[PDB]
Design a protein around this ligand. Structure first.
Ligand SMILES: Nc1nc(Nc2ccccc2)sc1C(=O)c1ccccc1
Length: 282
């Protein structure tokens, strides 16, 4: 657009490319997502009225010249870069806790407004110098669709569920939480089946006992290997028991048993939550 001065390309999203840009008139620095039905456009204009401190603000939606532009407030850095930058020493547990707590607040808010993210990953979790972290790049689905990171995909999606719930976001956030703690992706699959099987190898191959209805799912095969569940002490060793307890509830196979964001916020793990300042190199 002539209204914006693309400063730098900051990412290759899914629906499009994201640029750091400057508003020629106001001088405001923003994140501009460029894409490329009209009903989903409504679904979008709705995300605009989603105001919460832990959700990246969508400032403007501009549809023109066979292109859709989404203008977002600009955040300082993404969690993937911060995790990479913190790999030698690891993110301090208090900051990990603060970030998880805030993200749960953002999801509790989104979910209470019937909005699902669908594709949470470190790359779309944005942080600022003040210690805040915000959800960004919400996935629409049910519209534009019908390489890609599968590491944070909930099992029900991998098994072909056609209608996933708010539980898919809790699963993704649980995988992210584990990763912040161990400094290694929890389930780094390189294909849908490898992803699914890495989850099975760690949490055990689900069955009707722990996940009623799982054997009747679209992509479930009786021929799936039967792996036994591993202990969380080995899964996320540096995490204390309150953290492991919470993580296990965020990673329950059954979407209906999986803890909600609201309930998670009341977990004992957050009893001593604080809001530390991250050391950010910009
Ligand atoms: N607001 C915002 N700030 C961003 N800032 C930023 C700063 C430094 C490095 C990378 C991203 S990204 C970003 C996004 O809304 C976003 C859009 C699509 C995919 C992922 C993120």
């Amino acid at each position: 657009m002539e209204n914006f001065q693309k400063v730098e390309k900051i990412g290759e999203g899914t629906y499009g490319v994201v640029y750091k840009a400057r508003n020629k008139l106001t001088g405001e620095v923003v994140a501009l997502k460029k894409i490329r039905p009209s009903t989903a456009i409504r679904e979008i204009s709705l995300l605009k009225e989603l105001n919460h401190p832990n959700i990246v603000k969508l400032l403007d939606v501009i549809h023109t010249e066979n292109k859709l532009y989404l203008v977002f407030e600009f955040l300082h850095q993404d969690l993937k870069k911060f995790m990479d930058a913190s790999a030698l020493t690891g993110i301090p547990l208090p900051l990990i806790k603060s970030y998880l707590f805030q993200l749960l607040q953002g999801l509790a808010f989104c979910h209470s407004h019937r909005v699902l993210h669908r594709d949470l990953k470190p790359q779309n979790l944005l942080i600022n110098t003040e210690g805040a972290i915000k959800l960004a790049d919400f996935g629409l689905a049910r519209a534009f669709g019908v390489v890609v990171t599968l590491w944070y995909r909930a099992p029900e999606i991998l098994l072909g569920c056609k209608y996933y719930s708010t539980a898919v976001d809790i699963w993704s956030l649980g995988c992210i939480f584990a990763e912040m703690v161990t400094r290694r992706a929890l389930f780094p699959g390189d294909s849908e089946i490898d992803q699914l099987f890495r989850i099975f190898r760690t949490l055990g191959t689900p069955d009707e006992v722990v996940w009623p209805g799982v054997t009747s799912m679209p992509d479930y095969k009786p021929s799936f290997p039967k792996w036994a569940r591993q202990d969380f002490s080995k899964v996320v060793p540096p995490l204390d028991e309150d953290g492991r307890s919470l993580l296990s509830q965020m990673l329950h196979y059954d979407p209906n048993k999986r803890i909600s964001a609201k309930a998670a916020l009341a977990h004992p793990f957050f009893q001593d939550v604080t809001k530390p300042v991250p050391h950010l190199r910009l």
